Design a protein around this nucleic acid. Structure first.
Ligand SMILES: Nc1nc2c(ncn2[C@H]2C[C@H](O)[C@@H](COP(=O)(O)OP(=O)(O)OP(=O)(O)O)O2)c(=O)[nH]1
Ligand SMILES: [Cl-]
Ligand SMILES: [Cl-]
Ligand SMILES: [Cl-]
Ligand SMILES: [Cl-]
Ligand SMILES: [Mg+2]
Ligand SMILES: [Mg+2]
Ligand code: NA
Ligand code: NA
Ligand code: NA
Length: 326
DNA sequence: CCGAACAAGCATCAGC
DNA sequence: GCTGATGCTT
DNA sequence: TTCGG
């Protein structure tokens, strides 16, 4: 972290614009600048130097000059003083509360963790579970714990049906020494882009993980996406592990490579790669890469037999998961 | 200057 | 109930 | 807020 002060400043600005201003393109601009600066292998000495990087424009360069000169950004120092902005920023830290709900809660005089707990009945289910585990969801997951969780998920999935394949993606697959949550890609040969020959494929896996008390709560759940909560089992007399966020995504089996590229991320890596695809005349989602026709309408799915096939289509050299942490 | 900025599943609600 | 927009999230 | 054309 050669430039951690600058990237922290830009992330805090990004969060302000998203959570408070509801200015999504400014949020994306700040996040992209922080990402490209985080990757920059020199200690930045001036905003002019930073402006040479893609995604750093005139306004961010000027803020970097102020930060390098003083160690601080007046704009942030005053955002930190603003009660309304601070409360809105705080409330969005609860899973299920976004910028809109946070401003509405603040309008109704719900502005602190204490306020939220007294007004559980004003929360939807997702927000209620986010509040319940607010502390736990702030903690990182050591990779050793991720390995224990992987072993449970993969073995419990196997006991449901040996033809399931569960793959831990996200930051874990990128080799991170700690993760914010656990992301599991799931396939089964009965579910392809051509047909669903068996129902409840995701449900049965969720049910089994609930049965063994690994999954403890549900935030949202459909046919292909589960968003919920899990917990490692602890030993006798030991303090319990924190509850953890878990996402499971059931992807058509013939579309595994697009799905594993999507679910490995990072989120900014996906945005960059998808934006590059568009400039190359392709569109990429978690299912397919398709060419854009003359009118910009997606054509038919292109053949894909590896993650590298997708990189080849858009004329990118292959990048291993560990080099996608943008 | 100005249009584009990734893509989509699930929960919720408004309107019919 | 269905459809479509919106919020929130990955 | 930044970038490409
Ligand atoms: N195309 C796209 N993909 C996303 C987006 N957000 C997340 N993803 C994909 C890439 C992520 O690596 C993956 C898992 O989402 P997470 O929020 O768990 O991030 P990740 O695991 O990378 O880091 P973390 O969990 O915080 O350690 O989902 C997005 O806004 N767009
Ligand atoms: Cl904006
Ligand atoms: Cl500051
Ligand atoms: Cl694929
Ligand atoms: Cl598709
Ligand atoms: Mg993750
Ligand atoms: Mg562009
Ligand atoms: Na630049
Ligand atoms: Na939130
Ligand atoms: Na996740």
């Amino acid at each position: 972290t050669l430039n951690g002060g600058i990237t922290d400043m830009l992330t805090e600005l990004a969060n302000f614009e998203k959570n408070v201003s509801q200015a999504i393109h400014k949020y994306n601009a700040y996040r992209k600048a922080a990402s490209v600066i985080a990757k920059y292998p020199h200690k930045i000495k001036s905003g002019a130097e930073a402006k040479k990087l893609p995604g750093v424009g005139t306004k961010i360069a000027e803020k970097i000059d102020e930060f390098l000169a003083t160690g601080k950004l007046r704009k942030l120092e005053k955002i930190r003083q603003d009660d309304t902005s601070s409360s809105i920023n705080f409330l969005t830290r609860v899973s299920g509360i976004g910028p809109s709900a946070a401003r509405k809660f603040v309008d109704e005089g719900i502005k602190t963790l204490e306020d939220l707990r007294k007004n559980e009945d004003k929360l939807n289910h997702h927000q209620r579970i986010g509040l319940k585990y607010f502390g736990d969801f702030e903690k990182r997951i050591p990779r050793e714990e991720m390995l224990q969780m992987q072993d449970i998920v993969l073995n419990e999935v196997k006991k449901v049906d040996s033809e399931y394949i569960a793959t831990v993606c996200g930051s874990f697959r990128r080799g991170a020494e700690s993760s914010g949550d656990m992301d599991v890609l799931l396939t089964h040969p009965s579910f392809t882009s051509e047909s669903t020959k068996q129902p409840k494929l995701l449900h049965q896996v969720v049910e089994q993980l609930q049965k063994v008390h690994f999954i403890t709560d549900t935030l949202s759940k459909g046919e292909t996406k589960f968003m919920g909560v899990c917990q490692l089992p602890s030993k006798n007399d030991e303090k319990e592990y924190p509850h953890r966020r878990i996402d499971i995504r059931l992807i058509p089996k013939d579309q595994y490579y697009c799905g594993v590229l999507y679910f490995t991320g990072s989120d900014i890596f996906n945005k960059n790669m998808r934006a590059h695809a568009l400039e190359k005349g392709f569109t990429i989602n978690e299912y397919t890469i398709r060419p854009l026709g003359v009118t910009g309408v997606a054509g038919e799915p292109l053949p894909v037999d590896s993650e590298k096939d997708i990189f080849d289509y858009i004329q990118w050299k292959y990048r291993e998961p560990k080099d996608r942490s943008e």
